[PDB]
PDB file of C-alpha atoms and ligand atoms in Angstrom:
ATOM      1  CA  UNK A   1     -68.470 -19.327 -78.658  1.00 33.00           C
ATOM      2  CA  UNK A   2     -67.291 -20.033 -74.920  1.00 29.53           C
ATOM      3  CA  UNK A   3     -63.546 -21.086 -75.202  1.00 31.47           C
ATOM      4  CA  UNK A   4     -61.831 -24.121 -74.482  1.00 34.45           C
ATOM      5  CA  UNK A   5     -60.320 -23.596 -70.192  1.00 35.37           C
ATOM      6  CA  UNK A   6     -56.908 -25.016 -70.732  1.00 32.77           C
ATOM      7  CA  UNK A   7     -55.724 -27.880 -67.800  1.00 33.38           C
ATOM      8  CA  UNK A   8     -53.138 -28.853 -65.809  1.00 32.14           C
ATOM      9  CA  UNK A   9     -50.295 -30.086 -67.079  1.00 32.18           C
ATOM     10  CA  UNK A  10     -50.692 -28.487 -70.676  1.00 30.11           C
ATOM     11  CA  UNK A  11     -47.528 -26.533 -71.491  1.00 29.00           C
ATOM     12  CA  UNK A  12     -49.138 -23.756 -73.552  1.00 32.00           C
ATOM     13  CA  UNK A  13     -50.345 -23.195 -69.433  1.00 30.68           C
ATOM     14  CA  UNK A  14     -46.642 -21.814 -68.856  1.00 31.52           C
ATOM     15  CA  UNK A  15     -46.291 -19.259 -71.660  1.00 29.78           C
ATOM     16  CA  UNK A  16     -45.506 -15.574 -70.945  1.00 29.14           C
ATOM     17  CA  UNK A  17     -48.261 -13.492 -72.206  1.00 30.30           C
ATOM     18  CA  UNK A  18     -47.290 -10.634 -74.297  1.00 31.90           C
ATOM     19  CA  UNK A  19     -48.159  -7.161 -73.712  1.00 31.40           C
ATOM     20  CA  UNK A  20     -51.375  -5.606 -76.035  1.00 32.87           C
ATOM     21  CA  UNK A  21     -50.603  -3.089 -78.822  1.00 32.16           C
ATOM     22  CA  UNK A  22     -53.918  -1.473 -79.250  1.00 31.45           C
ATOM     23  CA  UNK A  23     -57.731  -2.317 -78.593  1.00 32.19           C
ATOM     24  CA  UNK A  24     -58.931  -3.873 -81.806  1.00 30.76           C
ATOM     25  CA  UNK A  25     -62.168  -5.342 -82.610  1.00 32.40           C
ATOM     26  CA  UNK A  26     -60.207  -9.060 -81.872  1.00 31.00           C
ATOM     27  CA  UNK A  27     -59.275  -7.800 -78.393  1.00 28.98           C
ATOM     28  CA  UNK A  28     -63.353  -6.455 -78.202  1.00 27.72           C
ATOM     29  CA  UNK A  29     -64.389  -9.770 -78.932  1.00 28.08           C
ATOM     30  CA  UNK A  30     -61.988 -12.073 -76.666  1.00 27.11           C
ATOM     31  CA  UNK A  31     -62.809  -9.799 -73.656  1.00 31.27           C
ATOM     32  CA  UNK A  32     -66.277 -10.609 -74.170  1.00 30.92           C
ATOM     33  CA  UNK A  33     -65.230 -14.345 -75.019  1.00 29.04           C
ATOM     34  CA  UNK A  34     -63.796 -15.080 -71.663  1.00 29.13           C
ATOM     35  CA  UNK A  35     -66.717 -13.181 -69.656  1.00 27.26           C
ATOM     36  CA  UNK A  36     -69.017 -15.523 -70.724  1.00 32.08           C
ATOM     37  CA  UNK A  37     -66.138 -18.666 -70.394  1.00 31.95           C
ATOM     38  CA  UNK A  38     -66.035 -17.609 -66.887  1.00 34.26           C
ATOM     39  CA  UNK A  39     -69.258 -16.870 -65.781  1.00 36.93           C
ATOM     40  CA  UNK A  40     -70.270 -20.161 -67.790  1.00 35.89           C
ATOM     41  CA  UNK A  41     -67.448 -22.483 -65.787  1.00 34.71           C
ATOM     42  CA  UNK A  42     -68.200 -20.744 -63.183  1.00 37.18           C
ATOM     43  CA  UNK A  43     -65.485 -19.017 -61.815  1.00 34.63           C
ATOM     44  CA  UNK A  44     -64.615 -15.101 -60.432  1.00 34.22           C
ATOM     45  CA  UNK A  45     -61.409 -14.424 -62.510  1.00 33.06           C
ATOM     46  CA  UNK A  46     -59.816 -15.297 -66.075  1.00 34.02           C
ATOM     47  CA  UNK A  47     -56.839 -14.900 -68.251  1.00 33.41           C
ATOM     48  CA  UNK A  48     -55.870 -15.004 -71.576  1.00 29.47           C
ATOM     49  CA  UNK A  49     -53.246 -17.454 -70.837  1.00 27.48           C
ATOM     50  CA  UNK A  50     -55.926 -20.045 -69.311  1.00 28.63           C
ATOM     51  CA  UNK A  51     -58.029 -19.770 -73.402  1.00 26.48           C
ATOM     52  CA  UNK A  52     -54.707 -20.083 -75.093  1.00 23.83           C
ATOM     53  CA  UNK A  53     -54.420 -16.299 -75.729  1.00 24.07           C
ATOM     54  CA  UNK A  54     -50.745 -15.226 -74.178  1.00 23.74           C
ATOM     55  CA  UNK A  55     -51.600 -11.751 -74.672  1.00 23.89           C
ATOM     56  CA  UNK A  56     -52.136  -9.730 -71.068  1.00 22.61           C
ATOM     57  CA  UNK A  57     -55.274  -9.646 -70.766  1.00 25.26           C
ATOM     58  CA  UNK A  58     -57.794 -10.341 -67.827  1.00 28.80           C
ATOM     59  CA  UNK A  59     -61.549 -10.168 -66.717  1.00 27.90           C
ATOM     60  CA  UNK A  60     -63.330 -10.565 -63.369  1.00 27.03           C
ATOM     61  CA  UNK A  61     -66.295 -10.356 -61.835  1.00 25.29           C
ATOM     62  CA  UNK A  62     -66.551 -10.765 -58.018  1.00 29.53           C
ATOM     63  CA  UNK A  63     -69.994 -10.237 -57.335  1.00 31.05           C
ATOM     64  CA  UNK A  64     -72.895 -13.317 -56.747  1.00 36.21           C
ATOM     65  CA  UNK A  65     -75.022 -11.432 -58.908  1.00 37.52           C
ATOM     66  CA  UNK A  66     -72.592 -11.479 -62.245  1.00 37.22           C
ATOM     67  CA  UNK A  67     -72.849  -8.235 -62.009  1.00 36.67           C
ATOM     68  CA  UNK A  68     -69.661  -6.042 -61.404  1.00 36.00           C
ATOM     69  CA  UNK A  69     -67.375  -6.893 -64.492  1.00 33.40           C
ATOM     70  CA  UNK A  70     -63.934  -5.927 -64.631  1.00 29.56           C
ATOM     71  CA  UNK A  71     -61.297  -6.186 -67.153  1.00 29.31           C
ATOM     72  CA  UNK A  72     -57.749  -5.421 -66.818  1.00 33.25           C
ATOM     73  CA  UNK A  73     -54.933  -4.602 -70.140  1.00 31.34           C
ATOM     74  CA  UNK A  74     -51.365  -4.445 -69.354  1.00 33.11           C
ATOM     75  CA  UNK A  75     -51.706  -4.809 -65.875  1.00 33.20           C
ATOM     76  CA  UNK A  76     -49.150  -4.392 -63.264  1.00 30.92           C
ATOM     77  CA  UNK A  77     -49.410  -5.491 -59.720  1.00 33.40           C
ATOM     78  CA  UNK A  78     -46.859  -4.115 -56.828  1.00 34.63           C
ATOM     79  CA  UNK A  79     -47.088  -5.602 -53.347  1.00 37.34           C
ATOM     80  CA  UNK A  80     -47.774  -2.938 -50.706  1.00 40.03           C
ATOM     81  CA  UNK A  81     -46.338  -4.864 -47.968  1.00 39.73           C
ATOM     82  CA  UNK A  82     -44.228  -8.207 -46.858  1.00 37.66           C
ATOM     83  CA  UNK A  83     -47.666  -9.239 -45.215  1.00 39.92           C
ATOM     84  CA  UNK A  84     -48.584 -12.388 -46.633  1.00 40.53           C
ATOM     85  CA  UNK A  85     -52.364 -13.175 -45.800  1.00 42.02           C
ATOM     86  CA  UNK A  86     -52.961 -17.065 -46.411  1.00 39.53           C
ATOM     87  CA  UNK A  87     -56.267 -17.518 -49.005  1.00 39.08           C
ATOM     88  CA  UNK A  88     -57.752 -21.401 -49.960  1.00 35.41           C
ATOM     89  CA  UNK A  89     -57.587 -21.051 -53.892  1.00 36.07           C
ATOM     90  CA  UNK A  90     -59.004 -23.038 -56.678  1.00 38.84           C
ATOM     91  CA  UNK A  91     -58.275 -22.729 -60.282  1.00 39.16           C
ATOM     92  CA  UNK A  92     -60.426 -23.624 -63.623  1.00 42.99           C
ATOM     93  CA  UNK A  93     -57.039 -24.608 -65.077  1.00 44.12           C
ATOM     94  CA  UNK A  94     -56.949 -26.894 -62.570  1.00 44.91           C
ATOM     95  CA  UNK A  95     -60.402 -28.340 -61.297  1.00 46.49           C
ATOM     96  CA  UNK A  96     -60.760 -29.806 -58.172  1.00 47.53           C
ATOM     97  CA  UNK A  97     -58.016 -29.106 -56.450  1.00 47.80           C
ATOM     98  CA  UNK A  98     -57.486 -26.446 -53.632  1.00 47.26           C
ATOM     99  CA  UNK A  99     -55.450 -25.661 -51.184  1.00 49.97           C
ATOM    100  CA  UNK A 100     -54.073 -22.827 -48.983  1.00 47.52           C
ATOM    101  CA  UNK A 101     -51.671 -19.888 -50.558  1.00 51.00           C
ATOM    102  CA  UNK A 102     -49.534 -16.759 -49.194  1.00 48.95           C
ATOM    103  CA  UNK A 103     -49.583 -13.689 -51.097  1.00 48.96           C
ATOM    104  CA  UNK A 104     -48.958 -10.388 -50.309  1.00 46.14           C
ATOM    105  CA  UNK A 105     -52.433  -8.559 -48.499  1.00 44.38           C
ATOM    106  CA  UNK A 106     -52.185  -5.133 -49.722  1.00 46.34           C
ATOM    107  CA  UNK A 107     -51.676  -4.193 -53.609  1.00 47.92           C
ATOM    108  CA  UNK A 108     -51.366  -1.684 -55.935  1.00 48.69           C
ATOM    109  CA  UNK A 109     -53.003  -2.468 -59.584  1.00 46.42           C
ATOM    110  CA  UNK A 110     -52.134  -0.188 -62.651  1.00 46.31           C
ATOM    111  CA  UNK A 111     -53.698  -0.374 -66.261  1.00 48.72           C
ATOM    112  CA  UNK A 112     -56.305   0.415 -69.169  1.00 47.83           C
ATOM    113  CA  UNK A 113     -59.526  -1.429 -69.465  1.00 46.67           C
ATOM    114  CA  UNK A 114     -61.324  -1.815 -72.183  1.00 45.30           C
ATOM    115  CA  UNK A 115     -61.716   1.568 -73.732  1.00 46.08           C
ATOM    116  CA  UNK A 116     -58.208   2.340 -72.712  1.00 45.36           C
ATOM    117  CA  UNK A 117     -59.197   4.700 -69.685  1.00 49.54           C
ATOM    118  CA  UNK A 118     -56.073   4.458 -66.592  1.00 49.04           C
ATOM    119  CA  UNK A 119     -56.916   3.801 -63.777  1.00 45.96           C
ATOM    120  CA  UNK A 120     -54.822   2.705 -60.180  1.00 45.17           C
ATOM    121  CA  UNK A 121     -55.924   0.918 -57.525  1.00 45.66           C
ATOM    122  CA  UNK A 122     -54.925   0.033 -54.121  1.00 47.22           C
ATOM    123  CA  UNK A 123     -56.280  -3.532 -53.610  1.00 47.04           C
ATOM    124  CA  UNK A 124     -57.427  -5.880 -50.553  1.00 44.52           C
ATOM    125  CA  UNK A 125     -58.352  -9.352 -49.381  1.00 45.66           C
ATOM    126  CA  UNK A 126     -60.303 -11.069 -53.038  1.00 46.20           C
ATOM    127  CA  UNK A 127     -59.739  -8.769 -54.678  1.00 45.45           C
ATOM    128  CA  UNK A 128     -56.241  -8.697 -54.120  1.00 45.91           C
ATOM    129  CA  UNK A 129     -56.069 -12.768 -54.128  1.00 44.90           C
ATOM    130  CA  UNK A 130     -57.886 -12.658 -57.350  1.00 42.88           C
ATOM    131  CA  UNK A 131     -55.510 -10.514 -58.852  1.00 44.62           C
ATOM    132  CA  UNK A 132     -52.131 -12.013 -58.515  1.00 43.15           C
ATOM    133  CA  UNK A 133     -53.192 -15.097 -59.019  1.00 46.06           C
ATOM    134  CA  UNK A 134     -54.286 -13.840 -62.828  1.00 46.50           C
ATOM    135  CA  UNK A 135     -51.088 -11.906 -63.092  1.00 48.60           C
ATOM    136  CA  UNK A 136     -49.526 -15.228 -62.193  1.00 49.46           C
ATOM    137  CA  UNK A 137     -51.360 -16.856 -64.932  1.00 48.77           C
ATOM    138  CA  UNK A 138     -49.679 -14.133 -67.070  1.00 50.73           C
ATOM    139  CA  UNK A 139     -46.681 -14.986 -66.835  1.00 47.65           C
ATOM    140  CA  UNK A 140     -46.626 -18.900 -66.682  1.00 50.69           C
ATOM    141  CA  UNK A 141     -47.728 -19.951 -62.611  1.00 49.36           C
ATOM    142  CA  UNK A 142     -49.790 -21.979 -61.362  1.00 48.73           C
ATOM    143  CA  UNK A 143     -51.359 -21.530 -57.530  1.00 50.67           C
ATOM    144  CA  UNK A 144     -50.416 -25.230 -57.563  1.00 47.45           C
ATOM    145  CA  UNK A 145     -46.177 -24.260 -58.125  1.00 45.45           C
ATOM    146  CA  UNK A 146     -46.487 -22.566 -54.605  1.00 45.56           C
ATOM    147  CA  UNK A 147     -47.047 -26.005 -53.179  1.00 42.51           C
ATOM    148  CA  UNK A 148     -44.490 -28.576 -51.982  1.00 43.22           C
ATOM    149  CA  UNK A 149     -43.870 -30.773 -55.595  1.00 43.50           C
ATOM    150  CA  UNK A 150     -45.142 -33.939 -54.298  1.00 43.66           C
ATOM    151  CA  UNK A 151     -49.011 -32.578 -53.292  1.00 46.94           C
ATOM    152  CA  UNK A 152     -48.905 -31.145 -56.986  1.00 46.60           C
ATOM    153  CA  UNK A 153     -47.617 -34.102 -58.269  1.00 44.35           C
ATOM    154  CA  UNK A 154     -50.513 -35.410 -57.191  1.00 46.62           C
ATOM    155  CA  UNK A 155     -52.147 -32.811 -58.738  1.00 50.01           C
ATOM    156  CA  UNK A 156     -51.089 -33.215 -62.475  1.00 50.99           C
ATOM    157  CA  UNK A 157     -52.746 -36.945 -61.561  1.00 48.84           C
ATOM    158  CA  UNK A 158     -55.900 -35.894 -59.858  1.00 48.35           C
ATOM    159  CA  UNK A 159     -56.520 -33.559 -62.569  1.00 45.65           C
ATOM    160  CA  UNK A 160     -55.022 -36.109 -65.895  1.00 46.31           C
ATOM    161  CA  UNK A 161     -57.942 -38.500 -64.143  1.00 46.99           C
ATOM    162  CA  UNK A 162     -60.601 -35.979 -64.376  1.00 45.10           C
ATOM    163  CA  UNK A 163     -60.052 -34.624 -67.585  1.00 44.68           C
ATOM    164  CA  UNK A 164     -60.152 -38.230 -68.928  1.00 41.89           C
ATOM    165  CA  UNK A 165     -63.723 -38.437 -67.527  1.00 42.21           C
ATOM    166  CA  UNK A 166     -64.166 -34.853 -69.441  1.00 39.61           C
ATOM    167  CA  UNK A 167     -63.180 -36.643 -72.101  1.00 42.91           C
ATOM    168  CA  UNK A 168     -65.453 -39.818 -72.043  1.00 42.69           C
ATOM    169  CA  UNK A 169     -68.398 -37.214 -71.106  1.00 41.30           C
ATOM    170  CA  UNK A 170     -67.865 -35.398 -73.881  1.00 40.23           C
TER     171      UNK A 170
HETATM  172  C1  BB2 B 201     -59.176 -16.676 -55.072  1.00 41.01           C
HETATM  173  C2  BB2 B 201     -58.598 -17.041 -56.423  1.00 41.01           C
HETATM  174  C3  BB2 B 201     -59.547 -16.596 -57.513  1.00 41.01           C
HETATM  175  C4  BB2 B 201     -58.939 -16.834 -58.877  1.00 41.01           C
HETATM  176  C5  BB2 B 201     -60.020 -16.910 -59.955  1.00 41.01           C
HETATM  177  C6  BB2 B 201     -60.352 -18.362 -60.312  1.00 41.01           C
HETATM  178  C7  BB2 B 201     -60.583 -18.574 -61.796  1.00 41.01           C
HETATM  179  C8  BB2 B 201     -59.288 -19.051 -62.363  1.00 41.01           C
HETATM  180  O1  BB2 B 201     -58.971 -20.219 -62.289  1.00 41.01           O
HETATM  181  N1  BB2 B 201     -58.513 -18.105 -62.810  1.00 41.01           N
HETATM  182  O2  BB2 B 201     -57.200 -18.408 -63.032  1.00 41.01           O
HETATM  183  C9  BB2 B 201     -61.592 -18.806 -59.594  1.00 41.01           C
HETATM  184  O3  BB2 B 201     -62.665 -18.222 -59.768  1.00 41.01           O
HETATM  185  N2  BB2 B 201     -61.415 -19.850 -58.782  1.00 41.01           N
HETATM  186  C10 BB2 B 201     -62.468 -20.313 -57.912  1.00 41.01           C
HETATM  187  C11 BB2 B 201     -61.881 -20.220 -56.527  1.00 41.01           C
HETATM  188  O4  BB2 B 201     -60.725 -20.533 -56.335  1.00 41.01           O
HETATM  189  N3  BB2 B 201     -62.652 -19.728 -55.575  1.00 41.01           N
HETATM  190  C12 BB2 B 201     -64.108 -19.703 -55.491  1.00 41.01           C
HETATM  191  C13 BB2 B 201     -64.286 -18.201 -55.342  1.00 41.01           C
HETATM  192  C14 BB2 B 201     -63.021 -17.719 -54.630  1.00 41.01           C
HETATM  193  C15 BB2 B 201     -62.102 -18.935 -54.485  1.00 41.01           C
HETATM  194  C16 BB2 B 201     -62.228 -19.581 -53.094  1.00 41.01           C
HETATM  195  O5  BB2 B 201     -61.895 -20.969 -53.110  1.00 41.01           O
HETATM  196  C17 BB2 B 201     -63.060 -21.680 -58.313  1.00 41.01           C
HETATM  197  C18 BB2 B 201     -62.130 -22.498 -59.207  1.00 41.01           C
HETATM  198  C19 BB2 B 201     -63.479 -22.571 -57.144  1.00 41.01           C
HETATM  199 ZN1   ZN B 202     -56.436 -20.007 -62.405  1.00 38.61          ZN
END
């Protein structure tokens, strides 16, 4: 099917995904899971972390045509400079909400996709937003924990009021 999107506050949202051991026909399938989870929300980006999978895995797709897929194993993400370039974000994890966020401009991505083929990137503007804020997703953060804890206070209540509505719409 199309997974479950996990939401803000639910603490399976915080675990650290672990690493992948090799591609299996599970790994195959999940990939493909979470494509259609994301195109289907809609959103650009996805992690195993957000379709309670804490395994490092991501997929993306930037394009308006749904087009240009890309999926990421094992990543790892340096920053290329202290030159923070600010970047409104929303997250499926947590709808509704957005707000302005600082991350590094320039990036270097290393890792395997799919059929285990390396590649190494050096990444800017979306598709270096996009990134990190997968990677944090990876390892247990929220685009909402580099706000001030009151406006995402506000934000586990926004978000607790709309899944309720899910809820009684579903
Ligand atoms: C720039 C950050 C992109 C991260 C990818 C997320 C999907 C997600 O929540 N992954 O964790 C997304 O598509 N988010 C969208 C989003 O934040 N957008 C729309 C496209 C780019 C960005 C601009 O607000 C939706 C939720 C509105
Ligand atoms: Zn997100």
């Amino acid at each position: 099917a199309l997974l479950p999107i996990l939401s803000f506050p639910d603490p399976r949202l915080r675990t650290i995904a672990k690493p992948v051991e090799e591609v299996t026909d599970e790994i195959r399938q999940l990939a493909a899971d979470m494509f259609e989870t994301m195109y289907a929300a809609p959103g650009i980006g996805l992690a195993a972390s957000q379709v309670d999978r804490h395994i490092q895995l991501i997929v993306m797709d930037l394009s308006e045509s749904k087009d240009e897929p890309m999926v990421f194993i094992n990543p790892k993400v340096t920053p290329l400079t202290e030159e923070t370039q600010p970047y409104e974000e929303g997250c499926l994890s947590v709808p509704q909400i957005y707000d302005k966020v600082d991350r590094p401009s320039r990036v270097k991505i290393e890792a395997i996709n799919l059929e285990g083929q390396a590649f190494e990137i050096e990444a800017d503007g979306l598709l270096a937003v996009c990134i990190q804020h997968e990677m944090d997703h990876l390892n247990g953060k929220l685009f909402v924990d580099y706000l001030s804890p009151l406006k995402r206070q506000r934000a586990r209540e926004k978000v607790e009021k709309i899944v309720r509505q899910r809820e009684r719409e579903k």
